[PDB]
Amino acid sequence: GGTKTAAEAAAPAVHPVSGLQIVPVTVTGTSGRHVFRSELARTSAEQAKGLMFRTELGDEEGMIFLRNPPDMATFWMRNTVIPLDIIFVGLDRRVMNIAANAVPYDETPLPAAGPTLAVLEINGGLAARLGIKPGDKVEW
Structure with a gap:
C-alpha cells in the first residue's frame, strides 16, 4: 500500500496555455x-x-x-x-x-528503439535523478 499521491488521484484538467487535456501518468x-x-x-x-x-x-x-x-x-x-x-x-x-538530457534547439534526431505506443517528456536529467529505467511500466 503506497502513499496516496494527490496528483495521481486528481481528475483530468485542461492546460491554460495549450488547451490540452492534463492526465495523470505513472512510471x-x-x-x-x-x-x-x-x-x-x-x-x-x-x-x-x-x-x-x-x-x-x-x-x-x-x-x-x-x-x-x-x-x-x-x-x-x-x-x-x-x-x-x-x-x-x-x-x-x-x-x-530514454533520450536523456535532450539539448535545447538541437536538431539531432532522437529515435525510439522501435514501435512507440507512447512518449513521456519530463525535465532534463529527471529520469536519472528518479531512477526511471528501461523496463519500467508506464500507465495512463
Whole structure:
C-alpha cells in the first residue's frame, strides 16, 4: 500500500496555455512509483509541436504523446527551450529507451528503439535523478 499521491488521484484538467487535456501518468519500477501531471498530445500535429516554446515545466509535470498506430517515433529539439528527458514506451507499456538530457534547439534526431505506443517528456536529467529505467511500466 503506497502513499496516496494527490496528483495521481486528481481528475483530468485542461492546460491554460495549450488547451490540452492534463492526465495523470505513472512510471513504476525498482525505483518506486513516480507521477506526472501530463498534457496529452494525440494528433500528429500536436505531437510535432510537443513542448516547443515552453520556458518552464515542473518536475511534477510532463507531456504524454499517445500514438496510434504505434509507429516508431523520432524526436528533436527544434524550438525547444528547456532540456528534456524523452522516455519512449513500447506496446506493452514498458519503457524501451530514454533520450536523456535532450539539448535545447538541437536538431539531432532522437529515435525510439522501435514501435512507440507512447512518449513521456519530463525535465532534463529527471529520469536519472528518479531512477526511471528501461523496463519500467508506464500507465495512463
